[PDB]
């Protein structure tokens, strides 16, 4: 049986504040700029539509040097940091971005038509953009976040997959890495392996995987380390209703309609797809720049940062403004020429993480050691190399950032005022 | 006279948790894919616009094997499960679908016209799609849900129905089965038997019956077994205003207008129909992923699951995103060709049902046995074959899912915290 950490984790009266200075990220909104011949990334892809997964490193409270150490017995017990307060500061002005594709697979406008559309020739793709669905979310836990998305499932050993055959789906659980993309209105799927077309969605998600937090799975998690607190806010509506060019993969059963004739003799593509639109963004609806007091967790792990680690996942599309900056090739002619100017796109993100940590102690009795050993043997081994080297996240080092004077920091003042004593 | 179950049903102190692992449904959004020459369903129709009716099977508390059995007398009484908490977990990202018809009966745009429209020829149908009305609802009871819809009533034995005569309407009560369609903006009616046209609405409801819960009838129900708790949330607005091609079934009385001339000599179709649109979808408006505490029922049956059965009806169109996946017939040519790619459509639904059940006992006195006998004779007969074999629902077996450790589950923790003791 699993038990609340409140059972075996003792709470001291010591609190420390820790915060990143001010994280900054600048890059191209849709794709990374690199040397054609090369593969080294010159400019990275930075979009408001990517997940930001911060791997927070905390100083080992056992190796740490406290002014007083009488508060615990280093022989019978050990120390762990407990996250009690978080403030995800965001810094750019609110605004909405926009993504498209020069060759988006969009046949005709099916929202309203005055006459039957012509006939699909070869490549009827259009240059089209859209404002993605709005999403604000924040996940906190001592284990990285887990997402779900539809990918191409493995086929059954029978009927040989005829070329062009529809690929099988499979919900795939994955680890959400820093830089991954969020569902933008086309659901959470792997567009690379499910769309040979390469033109069904805008460039920025076009050959990526849009993942959605698997909240269900994470909360079911027995120990609940992956996430002990979260805030989600997503909204979306249909801006336009389109058709997909291409060829019928699956025909419309004729028992569903009466054959036409002349123009209506041939059925138009009924492979409709809508254009998303996350409406207006607003201050009143902000999730960030507000402190989160992680006092009672719904999981058994009540904010204990086992391994002196801490994960903070964030997605904020309420500051997705992309800025176009163009340089002139010549500063002479007083006559505009498109060609005299090179147009570019850049997007900036501004973060500022702040935390309040509470020191905790664990008396290593038999039972406790058995439990903690079963739960996560590494805990004890590390007490008296990176297991997630495969994954990549925004590394954040706070080992030199802890301060006992909450007083001197904004999140600190807030915490004191909130907790009174 | 009917009486509250609180009268004859005794509440023990035992509580169990039970939950589905994670139900998953994948299919085509508008119609089932099957073998032409055949009739077996190769891929089912799975849409966010269908009702999901779960037939929950519970282990017989009488046959069940409890660690302690002193809490009751198996001679004078019997045991029944009472539903006290439900959590309908939903798992895909929020999003809106879209449905249309390649040959929708839409003459002209009547929202605004600059000149009198031409003249209906033969087949003026257009390839049109729309975003259905938004609907979120959850019905719970120990009897299947009941819906209403307009169908073709039986004609009076007199005036021989002239071909093309308008068919008579009749409100028809039916049992809502898993897979049935929800009103989408065109009301709750049987389009198959009321629209020979086969082109009045999108393919997905085109030859189906859109049913609406008959809340009034169900709550009027004397014992109130069909539904002892519900949540409904529906919204819709007019996106477009159209005209219907076809021939005047009923003419416009000439006392309602002044005859035209020339172009306005011939009256245009005044058989208008609007295009629905369930606006934006939002987190803040979610109904699911929240626990429902069924403590005080408005009906006489206060959540008693007679027959060790339990019905959970759901409709959620806030995750109706359909995803188009296309496979290339050839991976050679570096030039797009619509003929080289087969376009398809698929939609996925993700559920996770969780419940908290309270054990109950009934001392089988004379009066009690007379009452329960009148109410539903099968109760007693089953105590010391399926009556709804005709109907089909998502069968859910929980006989091996009960656990006394609410502590170990998210809904269980929530319940304890909520009920304190």
């Amino acid at each position, epitope marked *: 049986a699993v038990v609340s950490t409140d059972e075996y984790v003792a709470r001291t009266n010591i609190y420390y504040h820790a915060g990143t200075s001010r994280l900054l990220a600048v890059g191209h909104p849709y794709f990374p700029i690199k040397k054609p011949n090369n593969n080294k990334i010159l400019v990275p892809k930075v979009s408001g539509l990517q997940y930001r997964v911060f791997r927070i490193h905390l100083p080992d409270p056992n190796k740490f040097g406290f002014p007083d150490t009488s508060f615990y017995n280093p022989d019978t017990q050990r120390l762990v940091w407990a996250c009690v307060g978080v403030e995800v500061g965001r810094g750019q002005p609110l605004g909405v971005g926009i993504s498209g594709h020069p060759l988006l697979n969009k*046949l005709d406008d099916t929202e309203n038509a005055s006459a039957y559309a012509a*006939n699909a020739g070869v490549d009827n793709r259009e240059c089209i953009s859209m404002d993605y669905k709005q999403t604000q979310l924040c996940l906190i836990g001592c284990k990285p976040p887990i997402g779900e998305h539809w990918g191409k499932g493995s086929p059954c050993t029978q009927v040989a997959v005829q*070329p062009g055959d529809c690929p099988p789906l499979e919900l795939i659980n994955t680890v959400i890495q820093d830089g991954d993309m969020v569902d933008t209105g086309f659901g959470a799927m792997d567009f690379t392996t499910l769309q040979a077309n390469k033109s069904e969605v805008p460039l920025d998600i076009c050959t990526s995987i849009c993942k959605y937090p698997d909240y269900i799975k994470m909360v079911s998690e027995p120990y609940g380390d992956s996430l002990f607190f979260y805030l989600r806010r997503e909204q979306m509506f249909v801006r336009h209703l389109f058709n997909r060019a291409g060829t019928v993969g699956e025909n419309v059963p004729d028992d569903l309609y009466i054959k036409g004739s002349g123009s209506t*003799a041939n059925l138009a593509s009924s492979n409709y797809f809508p254009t998303p639109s996350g409406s207006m963004v607003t201050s009143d609806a902000q999730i960030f720049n507000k402190p989160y007091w992680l006092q009672r967790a719904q999981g058994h792990n009540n904010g204990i940062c086992w391994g002196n680690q801490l994960f903070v996942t964030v997605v904020d599309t309420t500051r997705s403004t992309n800025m176009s900056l163009c340089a002139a090739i010549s500063t002479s002619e007083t006559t505009y020429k498109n060609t005299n100017f090179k147009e570019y796109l850049r997007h900036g993100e501004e973060y500022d993480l702040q935390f309040i940590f509470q020191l905790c102690k664990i008396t290593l009795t038999a039972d406790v050691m058995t439990y903690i050993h079963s739960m996560n043997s590494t805990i004890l081994e590390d007490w008296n190399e990176d297991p997630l080297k495969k994954y990549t996240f925004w590394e954040v080092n706070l080992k030199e950032k802890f301060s006992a004077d909450l007083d001197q920091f904004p999140l600190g003042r807030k915490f004191l005022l909130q907790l009174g004593l | 006279a009917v009486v509250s179950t609180d009268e004859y049903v005794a509440r023990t102190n035992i509580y169990y948790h039970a939950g589905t692992s994670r139900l998953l449904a994948v299919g085509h959004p508008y119609f089932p894919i099957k073998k032409p020459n055949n009739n077996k369903i190769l891929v089912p129709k799975v849409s966010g616009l269908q009702y999901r009716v779960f037939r929950i099977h519970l282990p017989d508390p009488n046959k069940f094997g409890f660690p302690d059995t002193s809490f009751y007398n198996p001679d004078t009484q019997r045991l029944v499960w009472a539903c006290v908490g439900v959590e309908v977990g939903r798992g895909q990202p929020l999003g809106v679908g879209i449905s249309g018809h390649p040959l929708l009966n839409k003459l002209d745009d009547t929202e605004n016209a600059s000149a009198y429209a031409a003249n209906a020829g033969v087949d003026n149908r257009e390839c049109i799609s729309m975003d259905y009305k938004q609907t979120q609802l959850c019905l719970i009871g120990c009897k299947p849900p009941i819906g209403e819809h307009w169908g073709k009533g039986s004609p009076c034995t007199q005036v021989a129905v002239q071909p093309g005569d308008c068919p008579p309407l009749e409100l028809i009560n039916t049992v809502i089965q898993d897979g049935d369609m929800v009103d989408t903006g065109f009301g709750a009616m049987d389009f198959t038997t009321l629209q020979a046209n086969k082109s009045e609405v999108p393919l997905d409801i085109c030859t189906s019956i859109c049913k609406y819960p008959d809340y009034i009838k169900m709550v009027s129900e004397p014992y109130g077994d069909s539904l002892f708790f519900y949540l409904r949330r529906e919204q819709m607005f007019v996106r477009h205003l159209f005209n219907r091609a076809g021939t005047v079934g009923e003419n416009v009385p000439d006392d309602l207008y002044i005859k035209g001339s020339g172009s306005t000599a011939n009256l245009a179709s005044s058989n208008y129909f609007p295009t629905p649109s369930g606006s934006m979808v939002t987190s803040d408006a979610q109904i699911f992923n929240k626990p429902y505490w069924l403590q005080r029922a408005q009906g006489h049956n206060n959540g008693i699951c007679w027959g060790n059965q339990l019905f959970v009806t759901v409709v959620d169109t806030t995750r109706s995103t359909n995803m188009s996946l296309c496979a290339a017939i050839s991976t050679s040519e570096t030039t797009y060709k619509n003929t080289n790619f*087969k376009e398809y459509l698929r939609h996925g639904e993700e559920y996770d049902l969780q419940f908290i059940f309270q054990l109950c006992k009934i001392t089988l006195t004379a009066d009690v046995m007379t009452y329960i006998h009148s109410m539903n004779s099968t109760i007693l007969e089953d105590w010391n074959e399926d009556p709804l074999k005709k109907y089909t629902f998502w069968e859910v077996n929980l006989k091996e899912k009960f656990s006394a450790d609410l502590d170990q589950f998210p809904l269980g923790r929530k319940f304890l915290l909520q009920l304190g003791l």
Partner: antibody
Amino acid sequence: LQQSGAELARPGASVKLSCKASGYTFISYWMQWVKQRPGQGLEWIGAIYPGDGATRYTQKFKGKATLTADKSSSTAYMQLSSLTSEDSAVYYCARPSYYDYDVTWFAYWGQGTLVTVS
Amino acid sequence: DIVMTQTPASLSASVGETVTITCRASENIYSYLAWYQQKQGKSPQLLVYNAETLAEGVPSRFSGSGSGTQFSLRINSLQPEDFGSYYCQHHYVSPLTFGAGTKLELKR
């Protein structure tokens, strides 16, 4: 669309005609079957969509012609039964280019198979 | 079934001459008409589809016209390679049916 040159059949029997597709994505198109007797014009028999087996038949040939396909070999087949002298004719398979309702042409025809009932 | 009436059954003409072959439907077929040429001893080849659109490799001297029930195929300034048989066929719905055919022969 390679078709065998000729078939000799006995009266009352059946005949299986083949059509081998090559040079294109077979599963993306229907297959047309057309009859030609020297005296008369062209007559449509039916058409099939190999991707799911959907067929359409001339009422005249319902109960006479069966259409099928072998997606692994890209071959379309037509079978006729109860053959009489009236079935002796040249049978062609052909394709139907369909891209949209306004772009389509059944323009490529096989060489035909001369079926002689004798 | 839908009937396509094609006329004339036979037509003589000289090189350089403009001729017209017509096809009339028993009921409305909209714009979904096709035309084919069949030379002596050869398989048919499609010239026109959707009543008026030129097919792959068809000289612009050919032109289809019409919509509803009356259609025509006109050949401007006949060339030697244009003599042979022509057939109309609707491709609106099944069953697909053909016109009777026109044999275009060279005057001498």
